[PDB]
C-alpha cells in the first residue's frame, strides 16, 4: 500500500495473510468471509507464465495479525488449507479476468476482538455503493513504493468511472473488474501495490453500518502513478460462483 497509514488495532479484523509454508514468505493478502472460508486473488495461487501452481500443502494463512515485528499471544491464529478453488474462467493468459480464489481452512477459526468476517454484498448494496467518487478502503502488507511495512497499511480511495479506467490502460478491462484511485486533478494519492493482491477493498454501508467487501486487489501498472489506477476484481459480479463453491462443498 502506497501512501497509506498504519491500521489501528482491530480496524480490519477480516484481514488474512497468505504465506508460503517453507520457507515462510509472505505472498499475498486475503480476507475472511466465514469461520472457514477465505477469499484471495487467483494469481496469488495460479499463474502459468511464472510457473506458479501452488497447492494446499504449499501454503498457510495467518489471521488476526496487526504487526509482523512480534508474535501476538492468544490473538494471532494460523490455519492450514483444506482446499483451493480457483475460478474456472480465470483468465491468466490475457488480463486476469476473474482473478479470484477461495480457500477453505482445515480448522475453523474462532472469532475474537481481532478476528471477524467481512460481508459480501447483496445486489442493492452493490448497486448503491459501487459508484464513481464513492470511497472504499484497501489494506495490505505489500510494497510501500513501486520495502514492506511492519504494521498493516490502510488507504481510502475513490472508485473511478469505467470510461476513465478503460482509457487509463491498454490492458483489456472487463465488467469483472473495477478501478480506484485519485485523479491527478484531485491532489490526494495512494494505491495498492505488488504484495497487496488478494487483500480486500471494503466499503461501509450507510444503511446498516456493516462493512462489505466489494473488491479484491488484482493488478496494476506501477504503483501510485499519475493517470493510472489500481484494478480490483469485482466481487459482486462473481458472487454466484462464490456461493456455489461454499454451498456445494
Amino acid at each position: 500500500i502506497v501512501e497509506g497509514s498504519d491500521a489501528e488495532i482491530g480496524m480490519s479484523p477480516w484481514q488474512v495473510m497468505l504465506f508460503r509454508k517453507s520457507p515462510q514468505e509472505l505472498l499475498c493478502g486475503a480476507s475472511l468471509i466465514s469461520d472457514r472460508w477465505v477469499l484471495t486473488a487467483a494469481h496469488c495461487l495460479l499463474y502459468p507464465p511464472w510457473d506458479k501452481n501452488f497447492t494446499e500443502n504449499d501454503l498457510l494463512v495467518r489471521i488476526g495479525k496487526h504487526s509482523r515485528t512480534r508474535y501476538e499471544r492468544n490473538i494471532e491464529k494460523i490455519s492450514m488449507l483444506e482446499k483451493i478453488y480457483i475460478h474456472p474462467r480465470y483468465n491468466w493468459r490475457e488480463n486476469l479476468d476473474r482473478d479470484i480464489a477461495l480457500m477453505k481452512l482445515k480448522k475453523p477459526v474462532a472469532f475474537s476482538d481481532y478476528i471477524h468476517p467481512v460481508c459480501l454484498p447483496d445486489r442493492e448494496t452493490a448497486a448503491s455503493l459501487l459508484q464513481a467518487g464513492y470511497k472504499g478502503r484497501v489494506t495490505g502488507w505489500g510494497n510501500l513504493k513501486e520495502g514492506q511495512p511492519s504494521v498493516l497499511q490502510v488507504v481510502n480511495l475513490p472508485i473511478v468511472e469505467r470510461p476513465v479506467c478503460k482509457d487509463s490502460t491498454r490492458i483489456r478491462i472487463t465488467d469483472n473488474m473495477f478501478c480506484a484511485g485519485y485523479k491527478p486533478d484531485e491532489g490526494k494519492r495512494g494505491d495498492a501495490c505488488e504484495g497487496d493482491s488478494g487483500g480486500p477493498f471494503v466499503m461501509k454501508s450507510p444503511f446498516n453500518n456493516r462493512w462489505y467487501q466489494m473488491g479484491i486487489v488484482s493488478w496494476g501498472e506501477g504503483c501510485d502513478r499519475d493517470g493510472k489506477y489500481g484494478f480490483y476484481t469485482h466481487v459482486f459480479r462473481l458472487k454466484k460462483w462464490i456461493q456455489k463453491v461454499i454451498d456445494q462443498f
Binding site: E8, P13, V118, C119, G136, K204, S205, P206, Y212
Partner: peptide, 26 residues
C-alpha cells in the same frame, strides 16, 4: 454477524478515517 467489528461498531466507536468514507456517500 458479518461486517461489524468488535472493537468499533460493536462498541459504538469510530475508527480514525471511516468518516471520510461515509462523507463520500453525500
Amino acid at each position: 454477524d458479518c461486517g461489524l467489528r468488535p472493537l468499533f461498531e460493536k462498541k459504538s466507536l469510530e475508527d480514525k478515517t471511516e468518516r471520510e468514507l461515509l462523507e463520500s456517500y453525500i
